[PDB]
Amino acid sequence: AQPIVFYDIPSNERIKHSPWSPNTWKIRYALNYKGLKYKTEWVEYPDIAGVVQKLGGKPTEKTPDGRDHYTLPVIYDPNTKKVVEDSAAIAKYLDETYPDTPKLFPAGTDAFQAAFLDFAWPVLGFPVFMLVILDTANSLLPRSHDYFRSTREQKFGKKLEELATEEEWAKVEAGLAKLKGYLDANGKGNDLLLMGAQGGITYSDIQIASFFVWAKIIWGEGSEKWKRLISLHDGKWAQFYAQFTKFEQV
Amino acid sequence: AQPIVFYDIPSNERIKHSPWSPNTWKIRYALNYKGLKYKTEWVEYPDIAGVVQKLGGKPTEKTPDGRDHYTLPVIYDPNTKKVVEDSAAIAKYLDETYPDTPKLFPAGTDAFQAAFLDFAWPVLGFPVFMLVILDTANSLLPRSHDYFRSTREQKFGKKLEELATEEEWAKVEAGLAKLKGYLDANGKGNDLLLMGAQGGITYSDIQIASFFVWAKIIWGEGSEKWKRLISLHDGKWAQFYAQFTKFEQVD
């Protein structure tokens, strides 16, 4: 098979040009986990719409305001000659197109995973976002920085400098506490993967991991903030996140 | 096997003394679906704490004021001499103790179901509650009515008569739209059960059904409100809910 072309958002020297996006990381994980050959193309935030349009790709939402909205990740698969967008749809596409690779959506789990993914941002992703949003902006190349800051300050209604608070830390921990509770339902020895110790990694597991790798890269693995996050709940998340270490090829 | 003793909340003549509670119906559904023999013991709302305590049962919630809260459903299984409380725990008990019966928590699904169940009330259950809560209260025996009105008005901060609104109808439809979206992920032919057409009924499916059976019994199957609810999304929920009719036996 030829390498898949994977479209990602670049960064500056603050984080040594590392990929960072929680949304593109879901697909970077998916590709690394499946052992699929790919190459990364870097697209600045304000250039994403033009790039995806030229590819013949589609917007991932149309707002009541009438306007189309383009997002990364997107892939071009030379093996099928197809452009695929929207992370959950790409992951499903990779399952179907490369069936000999580990399945991210095991049969019978698609609806349960959709529900789980629909609450991943509200309960965990958003509070994390608040704690990393300023540092994220300061990790972008200047053009992406201006676009990102402009658009996100409008979205959240405050300067980026105001969004990280002790309250958000409490909300992060509270979200992880809910997650911990769901996992507890699996029983001891099965509470570090959504489908249990023998169930393998699902797309939903990747969704959680992607919030962690985002924070680690943005804050820095030696940082006090990363240590604080990963130490929550007696080291549970350190153990959870450890399962993804071998799938972070860049 | 001796019948399991199933503790449920009774009703008055308005609904012909039918069982009605969405929470106890989850376990009535579980028992009916598994084909297990049981008999119902009726307990009024203010009598629940006393009855469960006497059984040697436990409270299902302990608040930061330190006070215990007892709830139904509860079962006493004479065959194991165990009292089991909390609907999700009762369902799991029934899986483990009665392995020859169809599973409500298939292996690998417990966490996904815990997550789903945690979304079920905020996104669908509560808006339905607002639309059926007055009629629910007016289907209770007088002692249960008094307790239910007092406690539930305290919780929701308005008289029961004020809780049903058109905005709640919008919220019910929006919650169902989200659920429709999740089921669509299973693909055509597989979008009427969470695990697909041949995946069997799960506890999570029963959770959704229990909101429908509650509304049907409380409003009446021939009512305009029931018709409106079950007509949403071009009748999808009529088909979803029809899968459960054969499991609505009442002793």
Q: Give which of A112, A182, A194, A207 to mutate to test B binding, by max B Cβ within 10 Å.
A: A112
Method of elucidation: X-ray
Tell me if B195 and A114 make a contact (CB, 8 A cut-off).
Answer: no
Tell me if B115 and A112 make a contact (CB, 8 A cut-off).
Answer: yes
Tell me if A195 and B108 make a contact (CB, 8 A cut-off).
Answer: yes
What separation in angstroms does the CA of B79 have from each of A249, B5, B7, B98, B105?
Answer: 55, 10, 16, 11, 22
Tell me if B118 and A182 make a contact (CB, 8 A cut-off).
Answer: yes
Q: Chain A closest CA to B87's CA: distance in Å? A: 14
Q: Which of B107, B110, B186 sits opposite A111 (nearest CB)?
A: B186
Q: Which residues contact B6 (CB under 8 A, 6 or more apart)?
A: B24, B27, B28, B31, B38, B39, B40, B41, B73, B75
Q: Chain B closest CA to A140's CA: distance in Å? A: 34
Q: Is there a contact between B116 and A117 (Cβ–Cβ < 8 Å)? A: no
Q: Is there a contact between B71 and B42 (Cβ–Cβ < 8 Å)? A: no
CA–CA distance, A59 with A83 (Å, rounded to integer): 12
Q: Map chain B to HEC letters.
A: CCCEEEEECCCCHHHCCCCCCHHHHHHHHHHHHHCCCEEEEECCHHHHHHHHHHHCCCCCEECCCCCEECCCCEEEECCCCEEEECHHHHHHHHHHHCCCCCCCCCCCCHHHHHHHHHHHHHHHHHHHHHHHHHHHHCCCCHHHHHHHHHHHHHHHCCCHHHCCCHHHHHHHHHHHHHHHHHHHCCCCCCCCCCCCCCCCCCHHHHHHHHHHHHHHHHHCCCCHHHHHHHCHHHHHHHHHHHCCHHHCCCC
Q: Give which of B112, B198, B207 to mutate to test A binding, by max A Cβ within 10 Å.
A: B112
Residue A202: count of CB within 10 angstroms of its CB: 24
- The answer to whether B110 contacts chain A (CB < 8 Å) is yes
Residue B192: count of CB within 10 angstroms of its CB: 17
With CA atoms as reference, the chain B residue closest to A119 would be B119
CA–CA distance, B17 with A162 (Å, rounded to integer): 57
Q: Chain A closest CA to B195's CA: distance in Å? A: 4
Q: Which domains does chain A have, with CATH numbers?
A: 1-105 (3.40.30.10), 106-250 (1.20.1050.10)
- CB contacts < 8 A (A, B): 81
The angstrom resolution of this structure is 1.8
Which residues in chain A have Cβ-Cβ distances shorter than 8 Å to B240? none
Residue B135 phi/psi, 5-degree rounding, is -60, -35
Residue B172 phi/psi, 5-degree rounding, is -65, -50
Question: Which two structure tokens, joined as six digits, stand for B217?
Answer: 């019994």
